[PDB]
Amino acid sequence: SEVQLVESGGGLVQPGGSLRLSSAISGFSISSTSIDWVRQAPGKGLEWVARISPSSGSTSYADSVKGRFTISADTSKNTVYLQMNSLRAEDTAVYYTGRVAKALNSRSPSFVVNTYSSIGFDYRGQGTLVTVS
Amino acid sequence: HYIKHPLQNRWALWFFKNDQANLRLISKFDTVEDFWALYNHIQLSSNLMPGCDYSLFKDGIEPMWEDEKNKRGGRWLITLNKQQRRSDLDRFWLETLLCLIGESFDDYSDDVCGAVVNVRAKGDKIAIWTTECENREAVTHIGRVYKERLGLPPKIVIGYQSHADTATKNRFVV
C-alpha cells in the first residue's frame, strides 16, 4: 500500500544513559518479513544493529551491541522498538528501520549492509538522531 | 510522505532480440525503491528465450559499440557454461546491477558505461562496459573490484576486450 517507516525516540543522553527508539510502519505487516535497525555514525558507512522476524519472534544483534541493545515489536500497532542501555560515543548515530530487498533476504543482514549499504533496502525511513554526551 | 533514496546516476534497462527497432527501453530509474520495483516485475535472465539480452546503461548512453562513450571502450567478460544457468546466472547479474547502481568502483565509477547479460544456447555471458580501453589504471581496478564482488577464486582468470577488437584477444587479464 502507501508504505511508511517513521523512526522516533532519539535525543541527547549522558554516557551510560538509556533510550527506547520506536518505528511506526504503514503499508505492509511487520509479521510478513524481517525489520532491521541500522545506524550511520558521523561521516562513516551504514552499520547493521539488530534484526526481528515478528512472525517467529526470532532476533539477532551485531557483536558491537550484544548485551546492551534489545529489539522488540508490538504486532497490534505494527511498530518495532530498540531498547538501548550503557550508551557511549560508539553508539552516536542516526538510527533507521529498513526492509532488506526480497532478492537479498537469503544473505545475512551484516553482509547486505557491509556490501550493498543503502541499496540493499527496498524500503528505509529518514531515521532518528541519537547523540551521547 | 515516504522519501525515496536517490542513486548517483539515472540508469536505463534495455531488452534486445536478434533480427534500433530490435532494441527496446524497459524502464529508467534514479532511486533505490524504483530499481527494486522494476527488478521484482521483470522476468529473470535464466527464464529469457535464447538470443536475448538485458543491459543496464547510464541515462543518455545507448548499449551499442558505436555510441560515443562506448566507441573507444571495452568490456570485462564473464563466460558461463550450460550447467551455471540455474546456479549462478541470475545471482551474478543482480550482483552486476547492484555494483553499477551502487557506484562500487571508487575513483573509476565514471569509466563504467553499463553492463550486458547475453542469453545464448551454447553458453551465457555477463559483461561490464567501460569507456576507455587504454586506461590501464581505471580498467584494472574495475576488473579486480568486479571479480571480488562475484566471489571468483584467484585461479579463475577474466579478460578485458576492446570493442574495436571484438568487431572482426584481451587488452588486460585479472
Author numbering:
A (entry chain B): 1 to 133
B (entry chain A): 33 to 51, 57 to 205, 212 to 217
Reported in the publication:
Variable domains of the immunoglobulin heavy chain (VH domains) are ideal miniproteins, but their development has been restricted by poor intracellular stability and expression. Here we show that an autonomous and disufhide-free VH domain is suitable for intracellular studies and use it to construct a high-diversity phage display library. Using this library and affinity maturation techniques we identify VH domains with picomolar affinity against eIF4E, a protein commonly hyper-activated in cancer. We demonstrate that these molecules interact with eIF4E at the eIF4G binding site via a distinct structural pose.
